[PDB]
Amino acid sequence: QHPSHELLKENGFTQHVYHKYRRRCLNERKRLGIGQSQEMNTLFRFWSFFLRDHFNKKMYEEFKQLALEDAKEGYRYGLECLFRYYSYGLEKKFRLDIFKDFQEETVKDYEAGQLYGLEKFWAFLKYSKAKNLDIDPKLQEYLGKFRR
């Protein structure tokens, strides 16, 4: 019934439903402020899941853009949703360009004093042939400090 639900259903995504829904969410974030819109939070979660099966560059880029913006103000749900999209999405369908973004956002997250991104990056890499790809050498040191 709520757009998030019917847009995620099988064969239930329509451009028309989605676009009104999106603007409503962005309007509410503008109206109420960063971190204060629960509707915004639902959009982050929608993007997180939907992009796994139905990638769209434009949607993906906004998702990332808004996530980083919110996180800079200390509101992290968006970025958390982003790291789950990277970690879970890449294990399902790997994409080189997205993997490079995952490395980029993980290093920044780590250098900002957080471990959420690094753990998600390790959870994916540990079990993937992606570990044999060219990894940011700084990220590789950060992953070294992950011994148990």
Numbering used by the authors: 796 to 943
Article passage:
La-related protein 1 (LARP1) belongs to the ubiquitous family of La-related proteins, which controls the metabolism of many RNAs in the cell. LARP1 also includes a highly conserved LARP1-specific region in its C-terminus that contains at least one DM15 box (also referred to as a unit, motif, module or repeat). We have shown that the LARP1-specific DM15 region, a sequence that is highly conserved among LARP1 proteins, but does not appear anywhere else in the proteome, specifically binds the oligopyrimidine-rich sequence present in the 5′TOP of RPS6, but not the 5′TOPs of PABPC1 or RPL13A. The structure of the DM15 region from human LARP1 suggests that its unique amino acid sequence has evolved into three HEAT-like helix-turn-helix folds for RNA binding.
We also present the crystal structure of the DM15 region from human LARP1, the first structure from LARP1, which provides evidence for its RNA-binding capabilities. The crystal structure contains four copies of DM15 in the asymmetric unit in two pseudo-dimers; ∼98% of the amino acids are ordered and visible in the experimental map. Our crystal structure reveals three structural repeats that correspond to three DM15 modules, which we have found to exist in nearly all LARP1 protein sequences. While it is uncertain that LARP1 exists in the cell as a dimer, the crystallization of the DM15 region as a pseudo-symmetric dimer revealed a positively charged cleft comprised of the concave surfaces of two monomers, which allowed us to hone in on the probable RNA-binding amino acids.
